């Protein structure tokens, strides 16, 4: 039959045909050898500096490639319009040997980075995104003001709403714009005599970053950071949040009462700040964007993950369950408890949240829409079953294809 | 060329080569990865009615020979010369040729020990290998098959073990075991399509009534085997039930849960598969070791298109199936398996939880990191079906690659 992936939903016994992968312009780490379909950061999209501007002839396919799929997107392929935007691209690149996006592009583009995210659940949201233009800023404190901004609109007092904010593109020989911590929002990591970690393990190196670079830090197990911010050429500057622009929620379970006495907590706005955000060749290595977030990113692995906070032992010591045999299943009881605390705490506190089951659901629906509008996916498997409950949820019983579509975001390198 | 491979728990690293000896393509390629499936579309194992390339064949023999000599200290030796000899005169004149015992028995192994989908390789090197190659028809199959599950079952006191029968044959039939597991519990479509017992096996049970056999009507009734001897009609054989071992399902605290009348066989022996050996093909090799608990409590009992008993429990659990927040799913996921755990444990049956599973398995990749520089393993496989992340393995990436000896799938004989 067709000859493109043929991907077999195993619940339902349905099938289908990836003919969108045809259009991945970038390979992967796989080969028919071996599948390196698990690692984390494989060495393929990695942006890494190419300081020295890029291949002028190389640049132009990229663009003219994106700007085919914007005007294509405005079903106005073959236009007046889409030649002359063609011809204007060429001619900037062949003058400056760069390029610039009109701001409906932008929009555009970012939408479908987002769209054409592997791992993310949560695509179904994919065309209401919130795109701020910030690539008039020009210094590490104008970059602080949207970044408050950006968290303001998308804290919204618990109501949610996606977005993102685009700083300054690469430029020639230029210094890049970039935000060094991971995330807008993160708990410190304080690395102690004994050798253990304070807070969250996760965070150690950015911790001491800050430090080196004058912040005073706490000693809390919960304690937010503050950016480092990178404007072209410079050191980056140090900027504390202002406190009551970072929504957080205190955790407690529904039943058991002991659990609200832990002290555990979290943020409620997931803000990832240091990916790059590629649209039609040129990159934007500062592009912070936030959704909301699913239970088990929290509950799960942010929680229970043994380089973590790793509460998992607490917690089942607390609920009186025999933990020195695996065959109790104390580990898998905890971690359900420790999840419904943090949905049930998120619905207290009336901050957007969704459960892996409702996300996961949501997926199937998305992947259906987007069959039917593009003739596939872009998928990562791993990624998008959750952490706990797998084959419980619909998208475990369901194949996927995976592969690099642009725009897209991608890893890039730490700036220091 | 060489793959690094992370353990994001521990920041500890290691670099496969290991996969430079994979000389068998997989489905991924540099544009797409299709890891995440479970059939292959073209790496079938196409009919035999024709004699294999002796060129091919000859290779794939020498390797594996090659591969056998070394395993005992004795490469370069005298007899190993000569059996390869032998392997390339045999060939020469029929097209093929035939494995002494203890090489069979060494390929049976590997092959277990190269499956990528399995997290019990960790015994790998205690398997008991029943050769059945002096079998000529379907009734001496059914015996054979019968000693495999005495001696498997061993009284709950499970023994992982493989029995091989004879080898495909050129313009021959296959000698095939129809049904998927030695043990499979019937499906019975009603009328309106709905299915009571094992969904999934549906059509084996139809294949059974098709040829001769009175169905039961319940929803655990032990299924008969078809078997099949070279092209000849594949004859039906019933198991003695004092042969195949069953555990009742009960919960350590909720009284009711054995109300369900919920129960589980203690044999899972894979018969559907392909074993490959020197290029030489096992169409019926059944093999068996013993459950790991996901197994049973989460994918035959919860999945959606199996048993399905997900929202019973919960609502014998007086959860609020009301909305998905509650999760009620994972508070009764939970419990089912703590029941099969503990279930087996009071019949004396042997199983293994996830944990322990998956513990013992990273030290299977250790052990195999020193012994071969790498372990193929198929992370959506070897991570369990619940408390996925609580694992290490979770948190262990994984290099997938085809390695021979191997298990294959193979297409249905009907
Ligand atoms: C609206 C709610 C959203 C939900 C619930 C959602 C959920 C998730 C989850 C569960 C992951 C994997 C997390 C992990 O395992 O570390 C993920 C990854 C990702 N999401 Fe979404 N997402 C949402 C919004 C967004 C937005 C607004 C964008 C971009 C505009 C986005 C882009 C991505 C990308 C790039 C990744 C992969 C990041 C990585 O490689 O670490 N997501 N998302
Ligand atoms: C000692 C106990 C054993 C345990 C606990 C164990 C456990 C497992 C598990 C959980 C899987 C995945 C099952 C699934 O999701 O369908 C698996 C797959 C597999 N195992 Fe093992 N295994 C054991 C013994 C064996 C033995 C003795 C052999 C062969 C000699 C073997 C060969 C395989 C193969 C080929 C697969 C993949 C089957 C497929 O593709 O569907 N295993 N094993
Ligand atoms: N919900 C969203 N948008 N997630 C994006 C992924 C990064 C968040 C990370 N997993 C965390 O748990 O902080
Ligand atoms: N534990 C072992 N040996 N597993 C091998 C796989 C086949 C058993 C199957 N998953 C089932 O649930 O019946
Ligand atoms: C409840 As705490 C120990
Ligand atoms: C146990 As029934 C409700
Ligand atoms: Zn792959």
Same mark, same amino acid.
């Given at each position: 039959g067709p000859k493109f992936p043929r991907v077999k939903n195993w619940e339902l016994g349905s099938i289908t045909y990836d003919t969108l992968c045809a259009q991945s312009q970038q390979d992967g780490p796989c080969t028919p050898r071996r599948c390196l379909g698990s690692l984390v950061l494989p060495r393929k999209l990695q942006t890494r500096p190419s300081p020295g501007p890029p291949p002028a002839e190389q640049l132009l396919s990229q663009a003219r490639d994106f700007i085919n799929q914007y005007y294509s997107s405005i079903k106005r392929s073959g236009s007046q319009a889409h030649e002359e935007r063609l011809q204007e691209v060429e001619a900037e690149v062949a003058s400056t040997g760069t390029y610039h996006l009109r701001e409906s592009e932008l929009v555009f583009g970012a939408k479908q980075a987002w769209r054409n995210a592997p791992r993310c659940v949560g695509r179904i949201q994919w065309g209401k995104l919130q795109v701020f233009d910030a690539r008039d800023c020009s210094s590490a404190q104008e970059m602080f003001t949207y970044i408050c901004n950006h968290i303001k609109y998308a804290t919204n007092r618990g109501n949610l709403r996606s977005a993102i904010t685009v700083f300054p593109q690469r430029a020639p020989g230029r210094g890049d714009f970039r935000i060094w911590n991971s995330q807008l929002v993160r708990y410190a990591g304080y690395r102690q005599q004994d050798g253990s970690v304070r807070?969250?393990?996760?965070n150690v190196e950015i911790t001491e970053l800050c430090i080196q670079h004058g912040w005073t830090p706490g000693n809390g197990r919960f304690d937010v950071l503050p950016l480092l911010l990178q404007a072209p050429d410079e050191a980056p500057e140090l900027f504390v949040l202002? =406190?009551?622009?970072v929504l957080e929620v205190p955790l407690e379970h529904p039943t058991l009462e002991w659990f609200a006495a832990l002290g555990l907590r979290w943020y409620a706005l997931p803000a990832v700040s240091n990916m790059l955000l590629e649209i039609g060749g040129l990159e934007f290595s500062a592009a912070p964007f936030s959704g909301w977030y699913m239970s088990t990113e929290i509950?799960?692995?942010?929680?229970?993950?043994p380089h973590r906070y790793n509460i998992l032992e607490d917690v089942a010591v607390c609920m009186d369950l025999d933990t020195r045999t695996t065959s109790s299943l104390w580990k898998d009881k905890a971690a359900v408890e420790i999840n419904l605390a943090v949905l049930h705490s998120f619905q207290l506190a009336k901050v957007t949240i969704v459960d892996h089951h409702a996300a996961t659901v949501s997926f199937m629906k998305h992947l259906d829409n987007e069959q039917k509008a593009r003739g596939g996916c872009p998928a990562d498997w791993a990624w998008i079953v =959750?952490?706990?409950?797998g084959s419980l949820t619909p998208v475990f019983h369901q194949e996927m294809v995976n592969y690099i579509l642009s725009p897209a975001f991608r890893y890039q390198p730490d700036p220091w």
């Open positions: 807070g969250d393990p996760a202002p =406190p009551e622009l509950g799960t692995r942010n929680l229970c993950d =959750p952490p706990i409950s």
